[PDB]
DNA sequence: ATGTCAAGGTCACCGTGACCTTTACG
DNA sequence: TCGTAAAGGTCACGGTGACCTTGACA
């Protein structure tokens, strides 16, 4: 039974920032935390976040990232790659 | 004294594009959509706020608001001819 | 010596659709393939395509795109965003 | 000539996401 | 040493919107 991304249901590439995540959501989470980006939902904060959509609601995708367990502490301030 | 506003997002309208008081941003979005027969889907309940800030957020609701407000798909030329009118 | 666009000679922004291309030619190629746009040359199919004249002849600019090596397979029909595309 | 208007085209800029690079660790 | 997981980085795709070109008309 293969591991799926807890954020968009796409095939997870590993355990990024604490959760079973895919490359797309991993990069989205990294970009948001790195740039302290703030998003706003145009609807009622419950948009469907799935890989079937070419584009997702950024606000709901980032909120789903936190809801599913992605830790902002996993995104490095010192921009260093590799290591645990 | 106030400027005419875009019926789709409330940005300052640049003229009457495809039948309605529209801005350059919505005019191009409508043109691109019709020209490319682009199909969008709403992640929420088809009632996203389409403002100058939020217009990029939901393409499906923005295109539906275009049609709701009166933009005519017949205004997007199939022969792609500039000028005239 | 920054890389030049093989289509108009403007400063290339990267490798768009296989060739060292600028943003202007990348968008022109994308628009054309996406819409299956067919152009006609008003002069004699040999207009000079440069940074200052690229907008003059669409027919010659598109033909130069193909001549220099731009791949129509690089333009996504499904309009999927980002990532890396496959070629053959 | 020049101004208006509204059509299509152009292109600088930016987010994205597959894949690439770099690690520490077992 | 070596395979592997997981951090950040790369960069070429697509979408957007300000502004440009055009052509009828006054
Ligand atoms: Zn995902
Ligand atoms: Zn949302
Ligand atoms: Zn608008
Ligand atoms: Zn919507
Ligand atoms: Zn060019
Ligand atoms: Zn020509």
Listed residue (C53, C12, C17) closest to C32, CA to CA:
C17
Longest dimension (CA), chain B: 41
State how far residue A44 is from chain B, nearest Cα, in angstroms: 8
8-state DSSP, C14 = E
Evaluate the CA torsion angle B4, B10, B11, B13 in order and state its sign.
negative
The beta strand positions in chain B, using DSSP E, are: 15-17, 20-22
**Residues 6+ away with beta carbon under 8 Å from C45:** C59, C60, C63
State the distance from the centre of ligand 1 to the C-alpha of A21, rounded, in angstroms.
6
Distances (CA, A) of C61 to B81, C45, C51: 18, 10, 11
Residues of C in contact with B38 (CB under 8 A): 79
Token pair for residue C78? 């499904």
**Chain B partners of A43 at a C-beta cutoff of 8 Å?**
43-45, 47-49, 58
The candidate with the shortest Cα–Cα distance to B7, out of B78, B62, B84, B83, is B62
| C-alpha to C-alpha distance for A42 and B51, rounded to whole angstroms | 9
Q: From the CA of C65, which ligand is nearest?
A: 5
- In sequence order, which residues have a C-beta less than 8 Å from that of residue B74 and are 6 or more positions away? none
Outline where DSSP puts E strands in chain A: 14-16, 19-21
Domain coordinates of chain A in residue numbers? 1-84
Running DSSP on this structure, what letter comes out for residue C2? P
Nearest 5°: CA angle at C13, between C12 and C15?
85
Most C CBs within 10 Å, among A51, A53, A54, to test the C interface = A54
Strand, coil or helix: B19: coil
What resolution in angstrom units was achieved for this structure? 2.5
Sequence-separated (6 or more) residues with CB below 8 Å from residue A80: none
Burial class (CB in 10 A: 0-12, 13-18, 19+), B48: buried
Å between CA of C79 and C1' of D23: 35
DSSP state of A12: P
Radius of gyration of chain B (CA): 13
- B58: nearest Cα among A8, C81, A32, A56: A56
Residues C39, C47: contact at Cβ < 8 Å?
no
Tell me how far apart the alpha carbons of residues A62 and A43 are, in angstroms, rounded to a whole number. Answer: 15
Cβ atoms of residues A74 and A26 within 8 Å:
no
- Specify the 3-state DSSP secondary structure of C29: helix
Q: Are B21 and B8 in contact (CB under 8 A)?
A: no
B59 vs A: CB within 8 A: yes
Residue C36 burial (CB count, 10 A): 6
Provide the 3-class DSSP secondary structure of residue C32.
helix
What is the SS3 assignment for B15?
Answer: strand
Q: For residue C81, say whether its CB is under 7 Å from any atom of strand D.
A: yes
Q: Is there a contact between B80 and C37 if contact means CB atoms under 8 Å apart?
A: yes
| C24 CB neighbour count, 10 Å cutoff | 17
């Amino acid at each position: 039974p293969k591991r799926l991304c807890l954020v968009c249901g796409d095939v997870a590439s590993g355990y990024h920032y604490g959760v079973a995540s895919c490359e797309a959501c991993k990069a989205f989470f990294k970009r948001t935390i790195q740039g302290s980006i703030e998003y706003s939902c145009p609807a009622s904060n419950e948009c469907e976040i799935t890989k079937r959509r070419r584009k997702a609601c950024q606000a709901c995708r980032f909120t789903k990232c936190l809801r599913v367990g992605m830790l902002k502490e996993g995104v490095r301030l010192d921009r260093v790659r590799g290591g645990r």
